[PDB]
Design a protein around this ligand. Structure first.
Ligand code: SF4
Ligand code: SF4
Ligand code: SF4
Ligand code: SF4
Ligand code: FES
Ligand SMILES: [Zn+2]
Lengths: 77, 686, 82, 106, 207, 125, 47, 114, 94
């Protein structure tokens, strides 16, 4: 999603360890400029894609249903 | 005669009376399966083999439908995938959540087909069902809230084992599969429904709860419990055997093997031998090392020679040991190498592979037209032969007949009687069977060494050769076809007879020797009383009940899982094992033992390696390195003319194979004597 | 002192023609004359027709029968039986 | 709560342990049930990941909070079934609450 | 649209195909088996006798400007005569793109280096020679970099096993740190996992 | 430029293994037959190289299974017997083959189950 | 616990234990299994 | 047959390079057992050298010979520009290994090797 | 509860014992052999046999979640009980 949020890239003109240090610090800062928006826009929803052939399912279903249990078994062997 | 198809555009040529599924196989695309097994009949219960047929709307079942010229098939299309999704939703509606407990956890066809072709969850917010569990035997642990009702067990039983006791009882979800009573489904072939039931409903009780597949290192080997040559998969775990499985050989065992060979994997853990055990001053048996044992035996052999040295071999011993013993007693100038088994040898004996074998490949029993049995219960000795006979009598309208007591078989037939005089009666042609034979072509006459093991054996064999000459002059056949057939039980026997031994103990009864080498011979045909009192006997084996307690020295060898030895069935086939495990404690391989013994006694052989010994076999007998290749022969007419010279004649008392109660099927060799499972089998039978 | 005789041949091959002929011709005579002796036939495929005999103390001789006929078979058999 | 164990030898922990640490050897139980005879771990190899308590469908094995079990020898760290059972019978007054809180998230 | 599937676009699968035809008609020699993946990537297989021409072209020609050698790599497939597959993953900025060059090779069939062009390879080639066994000409310094300074063999192949042949330990008898043969304590469990039932009926292979 | 050498290739030296682990190791080139329990045929497609087995004992301390040989668990894949043989004879081992066990074709005239004169007639449904 | 006590269950260690590093009640490893392979128990009489 | 060469064309040029390399090792060893305070004798070192040479004498291919030469040269660089140490260099002599018994009876009494 | 062998070694819950002639029992000297006293077999035998009317019954293992997956058992076999593989509990029909 990095295409969504804003974050300005730093660069240096000389090419010395000082410029590199300053780049690292400016990135430290722009990272917070990112986190602010990540927080204020984090939506609700799921975490693992509901394709149980790839990511394991929740344990309640793993225990009640059957196909989800088979997929659990296969994923984990 | 051919017929055409265009799968996915791809074209195919097949025969009529064919199946969509066999066509898709010819192409490569595997089609799902629940109620199909190429070695069975057909049905349409499961309903997972569905496909789409272009130019026709309705789906079909590729396990029954015969392909019509011009059809374009579609396997991975929309309707097909939807059918499979629905069908598996249905199945898994009720299959309980015993996947972990289920010993068939990582091999479950249903697991795999759900993970791949099925769906990702259940839309079943309802209740399930269960069913009572049955006791069916001390081998086949039955859970029956898992049977998807495929009917594989039912068809397999009603066709192969002729049992006719299993079946379905009810209609609707309440259906069950299993006898209506607490009967026991014990049989020489009970023990393949395990491999056939894709689910963990009919599990094996011994293996159960012990391990899982993926952990295993599946090595490959063969069987020795009988002289058939059942290719086998031996499963290991952290350096130990855990289970045995069949291995597909389209000729010999064809994906089926015997209760004995698959449940005698425990006898390799009880009553074993791990250290050189030598007599003491009192006579007890104390442990000691190879240094002592071989120093002793070689210092004694250096003094003994002539014909006072005698080697006996039993079953379950390898051609390598046999050849090494032969060459050693040769360099020592002795010839009393014999086997615990008898084989009437007068006339020709052991000089032509056309004799003492199955001149006819076991396969040819499918193409034969009439079969005759001479005093044998193959149901107990070499059953898979009996299963080929079963399928033959079932399919190609066969006619079978036998000589011997009235035996409990799977089919019905004509019973001649119980006196081999019947054989000469036939050779004259004064018995309806004479006309039956002279009419029908490609007959076959099999004779089990269980009778030759009698006393008047060579005479009955001579009468049989006479009968054979008669039948051959009656009907029109060539040596390209064969008539006579011999069927042993012990494995090492054929390798010995090909290495040129004395198949008997007549030599021993004639020349009481001093030193007695004996290998794997837990048969007790010999003991201390049949010999002088100052003898010296060396038991080289891997199990002690009979031969060891009567021993001066006891050496351990190895079993059929730990020595890369050859072996030969009753049709000249040459099968080698593969070392699946390493033996216990001090025990070593037999040919190594013997090369060391020779090097000590100053008789050094040129054999430092299994491969050098393979070349030695290539010299001695060539067809023992021809792995998986039979060697036909045609000089049986000469052998029969030779035997005709002899005038010995049979006795009058009847004959019997000494295995009638299935009880006798178990407890043959050390392994089936030892296993604490065979005990349960027997006590359940009785 | 002779102890045992064995023949190795290759069914359905030229080099074995004379040996097969001898066997279908007179082997019967040897085996009826002296039947207290090991005479072992063995026919593989793709081998050199040969004859391995073995004396008392284990030593043994190997001779060839390739591209030969019944007369040479007989005479070699005699020379080795001697 | 009835004293009985939870492991039934489903071997998922063995087949998923990235380090191949675990070693299992199962058997029947004289009462007919299914159970273990050998469930050994090498805490020198265990990377402390979580996969075993993710796979165990019965929540039997649970990597716990105790991080003070440093020792003086490399044989107090090849834990076995009995040491694990003791650790369970010891810490079960805490794991119950921890899981009762955490399970919903998973 | 569906939530659990990326979009299989057209722009890339078309542009990179055009560029593949371009390079193919420019270098009808030193080229074979161009291809574009179903996931927006370009692969170009070439004879080892054209490596430097291809790389110089792709670095210099304006329309490519494949400047930065983001990676060099090897792969081993033993079911063929030329068993090693050498790989270069390259990056260009102006055109914001990546590309993959492949060339087959074999033990006992060395390769031409590129150090004259991409100096990054000066070390990837050392890695390759140390691990696999593939050799490179015109390379100033070529020595074991990763493994020991006495190690012998070629581990990243598929035959040199995981555990290796030798272990180490100190032996006060001599006070050194000696190398002895492998006698493990636990055995490397090898889990049979490959399940039969075919899942991908599109990547099948008939008899 | 090129060479005329008709000698068989051997790189046992560059490989880096000792005499023991190169000579006494009997290699087996086979095809892994199906797990009868299953009915799957995407395993009987390759050609696999394995080694003979070796000592596999039990540790005294706890009971694990150790090994003196590293190769025991070295299973290799191939798509052709000729290529597998080339690799084997190239590395210098002693190869032994297990040829292909292929099923037969069969005629399943289902209707036969419901026949009149034959013996195939089943007593079940 | 005074406001959130645990589940009152048996089979729980009542008397907790400090660390057991080198004490004489420390821990050691072993096998929890029987003997895989039995053997032969020769007789006790000369022939 | 029709193949591509490497650094050479025939066993003879391969062998001239090999001889150069022998000269290098022979003229080097002393510097090693004098820099790294070893114990063995120069003669024993040269024995190991000539043995590691003789144990590749069943060779025919110039490509094989040349690859072995390249690896030897790498190792010689490593040694003279001292990176390998006492351990790295004495790892050859199997100084903590019972000579593998080739006596068939020895193998028998001791283990399972054929 | 634990028992003991001739040599004083605490038998495990699975019959592991070091006979008098085994050298692998030095590690215990000056040390102890860790064992659990609570034997699962007795602790499940003590438990009461559950009773129900609905012939079929669903078992989970205690908590709705946190226990063994839902397994459904039959109880029509009045000869004896019906056990649950995971938890070991046993039900009976009314
Ligand atoms: S057969 Fe076994 S593994 Fe397969 S679905 Fe049923 S319980 Fe699970
Ligand atoms: S018990 Fe097994 S083989 Fe028999 S019908 Fe049920 S699923 Fe099929
Ligand atoms: S937490 Fe440790 S024991 Fe459990 S799976 Fe991860 S590495 Fe293995
Ligand atoms: S995952 Fe849990 S139940 Fe399964 S074997 Fe491991 S500890 Fe036992
Ligand atoms: S395989 Fe066709 S319905 Fe079962
Ligand atoms: Zn329960």
């Amino acid at each position: 999603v990095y295409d969504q949020v804003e974050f300005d890239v730093p660069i240096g003109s000389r090419g010395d360890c000082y410029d590199r240090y300053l780049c690292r610090v400016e990135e430290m800062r722009q990272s917070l400029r990112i986190i602010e928006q990540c927080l204020n826009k984090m939506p609700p929803g799921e975490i693992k894609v509901d394709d149980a052939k790839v990511s394991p399912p929740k344990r309640a279903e793993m225990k009640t249903s059957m196909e989800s249990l088979i997929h659990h078994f296969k994923l984990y062997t | 005669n051919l017929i055409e198809v265009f799968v996915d555009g791809q074209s195919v040529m097949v025969e009529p009376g064919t199946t969509v599924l066999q066509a898709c196989e010819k192409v490569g695309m595997q089609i799902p399966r629940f109620c199909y097994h190429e070695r069975l009949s057909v049905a349409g219960n499961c309903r997972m083999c569905l496909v789409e047929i272009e130019k026709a709307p309705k789906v079909v079942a590729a396990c029954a439908m015969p392909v019509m010229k011009g059809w374009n098939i579609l396997t991975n299309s929309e309707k097909s995938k939807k059918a499979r999704e629905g069908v598996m939703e249905f199945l898994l509606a009720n299959h309980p959540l015993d996947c972990p407990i289920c010993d068939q956890g990582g091999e479950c066809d249903l697991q795999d087909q759900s993970m791949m072709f099925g769906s990702d969850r259940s839309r079943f917010l309802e209740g399930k069902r269960a069913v009572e569990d049955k006791n069916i035997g001390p081998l086949v642990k039955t859970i029956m809230t898992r049977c998807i009702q495929c009917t594989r067990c039912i068809r397999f039983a009603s066709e192969i084992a002729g049992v006719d006791d299993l079946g379905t009882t009810g209609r609707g979800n309440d259906m069950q599969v299993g006898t209506y009573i607490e009967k026991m489904f014990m049989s020489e072939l009970s023990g393949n429904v395990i491999d056939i039931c894709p689910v963990g409903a009919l599990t094996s009780k011994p293996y159960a709860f012990t391990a899982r597949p993926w952990e295993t290192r599946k090595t490959e080997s063969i069987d020795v419990m009988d002289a058939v040559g059942s290719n086998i998969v031996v499963s290991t775990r952290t350096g130990e055997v855990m289970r045995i499985l069949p291995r597909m050989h389209e000729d010999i065992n064809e994906e089926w093997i015997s209760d004995k060979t698959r449940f005698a994997y425990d006898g390799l853990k009880r009553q074993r031998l791990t250290e050189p055990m030598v007599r003491n001053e009192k006579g007890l048996l104390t442990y000691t090392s190879w240094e002592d044992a071989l120093s002793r035996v070689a210092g004694m052999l250096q003094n003994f020679e002539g014909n006072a040295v005698a080697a006996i071999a039993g079953g379950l011993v390898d051609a390598e040991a046999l050849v090494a013993l032969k060459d050693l007693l040769n360099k020592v100038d002795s010839d009393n190498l014999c086997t615990e088994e008898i084989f009437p040898t007068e006339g020709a004996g052991t000089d032509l592979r056309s004799n003492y074998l199955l001149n006819t490949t076991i396969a040819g029993v499918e193409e034969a037209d009439v079969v005759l049995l001479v005093g044998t219960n193959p149901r107990f000795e070499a059953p898979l032969f009996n299963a080929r006979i079963r399928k033959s009598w079932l399919h190609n309208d066969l006619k079978v007949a036998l000589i011997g007591s009235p035996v409990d078989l799977t089919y019905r037939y004509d019973h001649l009687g119980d006196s081999p005089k019947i054989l000469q009666d036939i050779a004259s042609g004064r018995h309806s069977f004479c006309e039956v034979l002279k009419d029908a072509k490609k007959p076959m006459v099999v004779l089990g060494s269980s009778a030759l093991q009698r006393d008047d054996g060579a005479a009955i064999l001579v009468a049989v050769s006479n009968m054979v000459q008669k039948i051959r002059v009656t009907t029109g056949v060539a040596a390209e076809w064969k008539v006579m057939n011999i069927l042993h039980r012990i494995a090492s026997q054929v390798a010995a007879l090909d290495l040129g031994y004395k198949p008997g103990v007549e030599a021993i009864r004639k020349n009481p020797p001093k030193m007695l080498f004996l290998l794997g011979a837990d048969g007790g045909c010999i003991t201390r009383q049949d010999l002088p009192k100052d003898c010296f006997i060396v038991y080289q084996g891997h199990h002690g009940d009979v031969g060891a307690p009567m021993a001066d020295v006891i050496l351990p060898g190895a079993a059929y899982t730990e020595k890369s030895a050859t072996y030969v069935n009753t049709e000249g086939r040459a099968q080698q094992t593969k070392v699946a495990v390493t033996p216990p404690g001090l025990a070593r391989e037999d040919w190594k033992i013997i090369r060391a013994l020779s090097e000590i006694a100053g008789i050094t052989l040129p054999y430092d390696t299994l491969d050098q010994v393979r070349n030695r076999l290539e010299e001695v007998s060539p067809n023992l390195v021809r792995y998986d290749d039979i060697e036909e022969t045609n000089y049986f007419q000469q052998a029969s003319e030779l035997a005709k010279l002899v005038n010995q004649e049979v006795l009058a008392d009847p004959l019997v194979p000494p295995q009638l109660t299935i009880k006798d099927f178990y407890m043959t060799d050390s392994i089936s004597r030892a296993s604490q499972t065979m005990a349960k089998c027997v006590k359940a039978v009785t | 002192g002779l102890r045992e005789i064995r023949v190795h041949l290759c069914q359905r091959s030229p080099g074995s023609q004379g040996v097969r002929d001898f066997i279908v011709q007179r082997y019967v005579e040897l085996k009826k004359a002296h039947p207290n002796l090991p005479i072992l036939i063995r026919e593989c495929s793709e081998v050199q027709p040969k004859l391995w005999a073995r004396y008392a103390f284990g030593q043994e001789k190997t001779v060839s029968l390739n591209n030969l006929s019944a007369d040479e078979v007989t005479r070699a058999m005699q020379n080795v039986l001697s | 709560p009835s004293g009985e164990e939870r492991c039934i030898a489903c071997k998922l922990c063995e087949a998923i342990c990235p380090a191949q640490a675990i070693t299992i050897e199962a058997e029947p139980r004289a009462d007919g049930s299914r159970r273990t005879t050998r469930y050994d771990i090498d805490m020198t190899k265990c990377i402390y990941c979580g996969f075993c308590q993710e796979a165990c469908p019965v929540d039997a094995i649970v990597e716990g909070p105790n991080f003070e079990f440093s020792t003086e020898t490399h044989e107090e760290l090849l834990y076995n079934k009995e040491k694990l059972l003791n650790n369970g019978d010891k810490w079960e007054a805490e794991i119950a609450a921890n899981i009762q809180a955490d399970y919903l998230y998973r | 649209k569906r939530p659990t599937v990326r979009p299989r676009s057209d722009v890339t699968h078309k542009q990179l195909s055009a560029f593949g035809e371009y390079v193919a008609e420019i270098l009808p020699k030193y080229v074979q088996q161009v291809q574009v993946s179903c996931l927006d990537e370009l692969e170009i297989c070439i004879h080892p006798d054209g490596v430097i021409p291809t790389l110089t072209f792709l670095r210099d020609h304006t329309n490519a400007q494949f400047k930065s050698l983001a990676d060099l790599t090897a792969v081993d497939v033993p079911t063929r005569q030329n068993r090693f597959e050498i790989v270069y993953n390259l990056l260009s900025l102006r055109f914001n793109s990546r590309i993959r060059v492949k060339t087959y090779a074999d033990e006992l069939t060395p390769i031409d280096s590129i150090v004259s062009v991409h100096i990054a390879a000066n070390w990837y080639e050392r890695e390759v020679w140390d691990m696999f066994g593939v050799f490179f000409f015109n390379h100033p310094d070529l020595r074991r970099i990763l493994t020991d300074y006495g190690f012998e063999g070629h581990p990243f192949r598929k035959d040199f096993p995981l555990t290796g042949y030798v272990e180490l330990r100190y032996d006060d008898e001599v006070k050194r740190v000696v190398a002895e043969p492998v006698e493990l304590a636990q055995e490397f469990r090898k889990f049979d996992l490959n399940s039969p039932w075919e899942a991908f009926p599109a990547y099948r292979q008939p008899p | 430029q090129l060479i005329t050498v008709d000698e068989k290739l051997d790189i046992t030296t560059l490989t880096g293994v000792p005499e023991e682990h190169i000579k006494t190791r009997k290699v087996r080139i086979f095809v892994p037959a199906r797990n009868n329990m299953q009915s799957g045929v995407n395993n009987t497609k390759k050609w696999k190289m394995e080694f003979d087995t070796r000592e596999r004992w039990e540790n005294p301390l706890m009971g694990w299974a150790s090994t003196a040989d590293p190769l025991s668990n070295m299973v290799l894949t191939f798509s052709a017997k000729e290529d597998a043989i080339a690799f084997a004879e190239k590395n210098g081992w002693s190869y032994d083959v297990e040829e292909k066990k292929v099923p037969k074709p069969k005629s399943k005239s289902y209707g036969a189950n419901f026949s009149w004169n034959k013996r195939t007639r089943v007593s079940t449904k | 616990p005074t406001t959130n006590p645990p589940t009152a269950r048996k089979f729980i260690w009542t008397n907790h234990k400090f660390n057991v590093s080198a004490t004489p009640e420390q821990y050691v490893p072993y096998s929890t299994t029987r003997k895989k392979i039995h053997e032969w128990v020769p007789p006790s009489t000369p022939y | 047959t029709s193949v591509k060469p490497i650094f050479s064309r025939d066993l003879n040029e391969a062998k001239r390079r090999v001889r150069e390399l022998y000269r290098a090792w022979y003229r080097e060893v002393p510097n090693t057992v004098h820099l790294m305070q070893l114990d063995i004798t120069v003669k024993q070192g040269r024995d190991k050298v000539r043995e590691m040479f003789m144990k590749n004498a069943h060779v025919t291919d110039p490509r094989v010979v040349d690859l072995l030469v390249i690896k030897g040269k790498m190792e010689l660089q490593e040694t003279i520009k001292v990176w390998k140490q006492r351990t790295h260099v004495m790892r050859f002599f199997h100084e903590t290994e019972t000579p593998r018994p080739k006596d068939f009876l020895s193998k028998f009494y001791m283990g399972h090797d054929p | 509860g634990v028992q003991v062998s001739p040599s004083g070694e605490k038998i495990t819950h699975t019959g592991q014992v070091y006979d008098e002639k085994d050298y692998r029992r030095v590690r215990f000297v000056d040390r102890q052999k860790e064992v659990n006293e609570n034997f699962a077999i007795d602790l499940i035998a003590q438990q009461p046999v559950n009773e129900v009317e609905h012939r079929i019954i669903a078992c989970d293992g205690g908590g709705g979640a946190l226990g063994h997956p839902k397994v459904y058992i039959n109880l029509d076999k009045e000869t004896k009980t019906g056990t649950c593989g995971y938890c070991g509990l046993q039900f009976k029909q009314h």
